[PDB]
Each structure stands twice: as structure tokens, then as C-alpha cells.
Design an enzyme around this catalytic site. Structure first.
Site, mmCIF file in Angstrom:
data_model
loop_
_atom_site.group_PDB
_atom_site.id
_atom_site.type_symbol
_atom_site.label_atom_id
_atom_site.label_comp_id
_atom_site.label_asym_id
_atom_site.label_seq_id
_atom_site.Cartn_x
_atom_site.Cartn_y
_atom_site.Cartn_z
ATOM 1 N N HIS A 1 -4.100 -33.044 53.722
ATOM 2 C CA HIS A 1 -3.726 -31.636 53.889
ATOM 3 C C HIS A 1 -4.646 -30.706 54.688
ATOM 4 C CE1 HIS A 1 -6.443 -30.626 50.594
ATOM 5 N NE2 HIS A 1 -6.160 -29.347 50.771
ATOM 6 N N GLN B 1 -13.168 -12.559 43.196
ATOM 7 C CA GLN B 1 -12.566 -13.701 42.523
ATOM 8 C C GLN B 1 -11.595 -13.208 41.454
ATOM 9 O OE1 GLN B 1 -13.138 -17.462 43.040
ATOM 10 N NE2 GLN B 1 -13.093 -16.196 44.896
ATOM 11 N N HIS C 1 -13.576 -27.120 53.291
ATOM 12 C CA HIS C 1 -12.405 -27.903 53.683
ATOM 13 C C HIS C 1 -12.860 -29.235 54.251
ATOM 14 C CE1 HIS C 1 -10.982 -23.659 53.879
ATOM 15 N NE2 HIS C 1 -9.997 -24.198 53.185
ATOM 16 N N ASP D 1 -4.200 -27.474 45.624
ATOM 17 C CA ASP D 1 -5.130 -26.923 46.616
ATOM 18 C C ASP D 1 -6.142 -26.001 45.927
ATOM 19 O OD1 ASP D 1 -6.191 -26.547 49.222
ATOM 20 O OD2 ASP D 1 -4.485 -25.357 49.922
ATOM 21 N N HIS E 1 -13.007 -32.095 49.134
ATOM 22 C CA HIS E 1 -11.874 -31.254 48.767
ATOM 23 C C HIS E 1 -10.568 -32.060 48.817
ATOM 24 C CE1 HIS E 1 -9.221 -27.816 48.503
ATOM 25 N NE2 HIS E 1 -8.718 -28.059 49.701
#
Ligand SMILES: Nc1ncnc2c1ncn2[C@@H]1O[C@@H]2COP(=O)(O)O[C@H]2[C@H]1O
Ligand SMILES: [Mg+2]
Ligand SMILES: [Zn+2]
EC number: 3.1.4.17
Length: 330
Positions: free
Chosen positions: A117, A280, A79, A228, A83
Site C-alpha cells: 500500500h 493527536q 511510510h 493503515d 509500516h
């Protein structure tokens, strides 16, 4: 408070010009900003200009805003600033391909929301903050980090010479902040599940109405989730390298929990790396695929994101079957 960029930083950004070869590549959904680090700030200016217009924002304030935003992202594995720009670019591609569906206000609001964000993210999930009664969890009951991100965004807007939205009329100003607030809160994945189910129901029954503000907000929220999670829509090698970063940050959180006498979930346990492939697979089936599927139904031009996500799902299944390859990590 909010760290402020230096004069050399914003002044330099003003002189940036995107290389010709990139102008083409930047319009595609699969574009990876990865090999162009020194250009990230300039790439964002470029997207805002193409989508919103050369004179939408006073250049000086825009450059000050961007560089201060970059400065307020932390040095965490995932983050981070990289990103933020990656998410902003996905939004850019979505808006470019559905240009007239969104107002000028929403486009400028959404690009800025994507850049901010995860502003000031410290590398700790809401799960962590809320389970250790961190002050933030007390201040923000739900969507803890997301509410913090928005608060940080407005704080930066209030720095001297940083308010790019000041020239907006009083009602549009309030409007853009609400667009940004809702967009950033939408990145709380906890809210995604309900949002997607609602939109899926609306779409299938034919209720979905883009002129219905309540409907608009949901669509925008989904677009935010899509951007995102966009790493799952890049070419496989890129997707894999980003997954490494996602886990590096999660394992770091797991190590902190351990130090405090609390065992972390398998996903945040670096001693359980073997379960990543299956983890995943679960994530794509439960989150990514449904997300891009519903988004494509509502906004057909975003189809490429779903196709790419499906191809990566296939790669993870290949990994699970024991047909992995090329293992290179910096
Ligand atoms: N490959 C992945 N890419 C992105 N998010 C992921 C992935 N696997 C799991 N996630 C989860 O999805 C969430 C998306 O938002 P966050 O970054 O807050 O936290 C992320 C993780 O909890
Ligand atoms: Mg976040
Ligand atoms: Zn994010």
C-alpha cells in the site's frame, strides 16, 4: 525501474519458520511486530499461509515477491517496510476474525494490498506533490501517491518469477487486481471521510448489504483505513513511539517546504512540537474513533481495535493534562 531482491534474500526467506511463542501472539489485534525485525518477511509469509493456505502461492514466487517489495520501500521514518508489515498484520487479524465473510480471492488480494500500500513512498504527502506540481501530481490528479503505489505493485508482479497471481483464471486475475487497486486507493485518507459517512448511513438505515458489491467495496475500503491507522490501537508505549516516527517524517517534509519559501502547516512544523498532543487528540476525534466505531458496528469481532483506540485517546488527554511520563526515544 523496480529494484529486484537478491537470490540470497528470497532463498533465505523460504527457510524461515516462525518461533512457536509467536504463533499465539500474532493472532491478537494488539500484536506489535516491532521487536522482531529480522522476522518481518517471514511473519508475512506465515500470515498468508494461515489465512490463504500453504499452496495458495508458489513459495518461490511468494518469497521473491516479498523480498523485492521490501527492497522497493524507502528508508523514510514512517511510510516504510515496517509500516507495510504492521498494516498487513492488522488486516490478517481482521480477516482471521471474520474469515468466512471474505472470499479466498479477497483475502489474498487484501494481504498483498496491505504489504504494497505505500510501495516506493518517498516521504512526501499528496499535499506536497500537488502544491509543487511534481510530475506525479500531473500523472495522478487525485490520490496521487496511492495511484503510484498500485502502479508499483503491478510492476513488481511483472518482474520475472514474481507473479504470484498468474495461476489464477483470467477473470479472477482481473478481479484480484481490481480488489488490490481499490484497496490501495482507499488508503487515501481524503476518501475515508466520505466512505465512512456513506457506510454509517447504510448501517443505520439498514441498507448495508454485504452481498452488494458496491457495499462490499466500501467495507473493504474502511478495513484498509483501519489497518493503515492501526498504530493507534497498540499498547500506549508502542503507539507513542510510532507517533514519533510519523512526526519525524512530517517535520522533514516541513523543512523542505521552508527551503522553498512555503511555510508548512503546524503539524509539519518541527518548531511547533508543543501542539502535537492537541493535534493527536483532534486526529482521534475526527478520524480514528469514528473509523473504528463504524468498523466495529459492521464487523463486531474487530471490537478490540476500538477499545484500544479509545484507551490511547485517554492517554493523549492525560498528556494534555500534564500527566505524561517515560520519555525514551532511539
Ligand atoms: N497518529 C497518527 N497515525 C496515523 N496517521 C496519522 C496520525 N496523525 C495524523 N495522521 C494522518 O493520517 C494519515 C493516514 O495516512 P497517511 O500515512 O497518508 O498520512 C497520515 C496523516 O496525514
Ligand atoms: Mg499512504
Ligand atoms: Zn500506510
Amino acid at each position: 525501474h523496480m529494484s529486484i531482491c537478491t537470490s540470497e534474500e528470497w532463498q533465505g526467506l523460504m527457510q524461515f519458520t516462525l518461533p512457536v511463542r509467536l504463533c499465539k501472539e500474532i493472532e491478537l489485534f494488539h500484536f506489535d511486530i516491532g521487536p522482531f525485525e529480522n522476522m518481518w518477511p517471514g511473519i508475512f509469509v506465515y500470515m498468508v499461509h494461515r489465512s490463504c493456505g500453504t499452496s495458495c502461492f508458489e513459495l518461490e514466487k511468494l518469497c521473491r515477491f516479498i523480498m523485492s517489495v521490501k527492497k522497493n520501500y524507502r528508508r523514510v521514518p514512517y511510510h516504510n517496510w515496517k509500516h507495510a508489515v504492521t498494516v498487513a498484520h492488522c488486516m490478517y487479524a481482521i480477516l482471521q476474525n471474520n474469515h468466512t465473510l471474505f472470499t479466498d480471492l479477497e483475502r489474498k488480494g487484501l494481504l498483498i494490498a496491505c504489504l504494497c500500500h505505500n510501495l516506493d513512498h518517498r516521504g512526501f504527502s499528496n499535499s506536497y506533490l500537488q502544491k509543487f506540481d511534481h510530475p506525479l501530481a500531473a500523472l495522478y490528479s487525485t490520490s496521487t501517491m496511492e495511484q503510484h503505489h498500485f502502479s508499483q505493485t503491478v510492476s513488481i508482479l511483472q518482474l520475472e518469477g514474481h507473479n504470484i497471481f498468474s495461476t489464477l483464471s483470467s477473470s479472477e486475475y482481473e478481479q484480484v487486481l481490481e480488489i488490490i487497486r481499490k484497496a490501495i486507493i482507499a488508503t487515501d485518507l481524503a476518501l475515508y471521510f466520505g466512505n465512512r459517512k456513506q457506510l454509517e448511513e447504510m448501517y443505520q438505515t439498514g441498507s448495508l448489504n454485504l452481498n452488494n458489491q458496491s457495499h462490499r467495496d466500501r467495507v473493504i475500503g474502511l478495513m484498509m483505513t483501519a489497518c493503515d491507522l492501526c498504530s493507534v490501537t497498540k499498547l500506549w508505549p508502542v503507539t507513542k513511539l510510532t507517533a514519533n516516527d510519523i512526526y519525524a517524517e512530517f517535520w522533514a517534509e516541513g523543512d523542505e517546504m521552508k527551503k522553498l519559501g512555503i511555510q508548512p502547516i503546524p503539524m509539519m512544523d518541527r518548531d511547533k512540537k508543543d501542539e502535537v498532543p492537541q493535534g493527536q487528540l483532534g486526529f482521534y476525534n475526527a478520524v480514528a474513533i469514528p473509523c473504528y466505531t463504524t468498523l466495529t458496528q459492521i464487523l463486531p469481532p474487530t471490537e478490540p481495535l476500538l477499545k484500544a483506540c479509545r484507551d490511547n485517546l485517554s492517554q493523549w488527554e492525560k498528556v494534555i493534562r500534564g500527566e505524561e511520563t517515560a520519555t525514551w526515544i532511539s
